[PDB]
Amino acid sequence: VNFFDELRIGLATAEDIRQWSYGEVKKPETINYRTLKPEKDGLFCEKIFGPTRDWECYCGKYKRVRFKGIICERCGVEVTRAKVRRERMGHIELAAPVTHIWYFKGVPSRLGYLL
């Protein structure tokens, strides 16, 4: 509940990020400029993070209040308060490995000393 004996910062890894996130962003499109709704798998799609509103399935199939933890097959979204939208993340998949800017540029450069 509120017990924190310690706090340790660990260096993550690809599989860790795979575990953390709930989606795979693929398009840069922001909220729609006409209907003011997210685009399919866009940067705000409810299929990634969650419903814009609370207890509201995207297609309206399970919009009733008495729905919690039930994922809608018709629209592929989960039914929970809008707060859950603030507590879920997404991960981009890379087609080419990269480096962490904080290391090859930091002074001292951890990569330089280690390698």
Binding site: V1, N2, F3, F4, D5, E6, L7, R8, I9, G10, L11, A12, D16, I17, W20, R86, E87, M89, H100
Partner: peptide, 28 residues
Amino acid sequence: PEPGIPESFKVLLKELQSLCLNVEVLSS
């Protein structure tokens, strides 16, 4: 009832976890 976890700390976590710094809790 006793207070809970402030929103500021949870936001700080969910933001620091985005820089690949795996911030654990170690409740033990």
